[model samples]
Target: VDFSITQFVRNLGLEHLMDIFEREQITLRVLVEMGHKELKEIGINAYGHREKLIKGVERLISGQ
Candidate 1:
């Protein structure tokens, strides 16, 4: 994962982030679920982030 790109997209806000994710073939739900699973495997706490990620996914799919 490219932290720089991630931060860049995040800074640009949701619409642009959705474009990047779409181009990368990464769905919002997938990212949220994957993040939770990975964090769980690592024994890290990942709760609220999942919701936020899911919201991002919804925003992406909602054609906003």
Candidate 2:
């Protein structure tokens, strides 16, 4: 399949967070512009979870 947020989140082991992510229309490029505050607005309030996503996003972009 084409690159997508669903696939990316699944790969990060955060598929449980998919519902809000989908509702927010969070694409990889969109997430690149996001920060902790933005994530919090989207309901991902856990510190570890936010860090995990931030790191995963960094890794995904850096590895490309």
Candidate 3:
């Protein structure tokens, strides 16, 4: 599962999260439960990245 989450975020074009995905060890499980504060703590502060995170998690939650 080394590249599992990183690959997923990269596939979505949210490259900003790649480092966080790798270093912070964030899992898809936490991603689905993440919000602004949680995501911000993970270094996803850029407006575009944050937007993508929200959208991505939405798709994840909905099985999209």
Residues 1-64 of candidate 2: C-alpha lDDT, one tens digit per residue? 2258788889889999988887888887887778899999999989888888999988887998
lDDT value for candidate 2?
0.85
Q: Is candidate 2 or candidate 3 better by TM-score?
A: 2
Model 2 residue runs over 4 Å out of place are 1-3
**Model 3 regions more than 4 Å off:** none
Q: On a 0 to 1 TM-score scale, where does candidate 2 land against the true structure?
A: 0.86
Candidate 1 least-lDDT 10 residues = 37-46
| Deviation (Å) of 11 in candidate 3 | 2.4
lDDT of 3 at 13: 89
State every prediction's TM-score relative to the real structure.
0.36, 0.86, 0.75
Whose TM-score is greatest here? 2
Candidate 3 lDDT over residue span 1-64, tens digit each: 5556676688688876677767877877767677788888878888777778788778766895
Candidate 3 positional error at 6, Å: 2.3
After superposing candidate 1 on the true structure, give the runs of residues whose Cα lies further than 4 Å from its correct spot: 1-44
lDDT of 1 by residue, 37-58 (tens): 6534433344664445545555
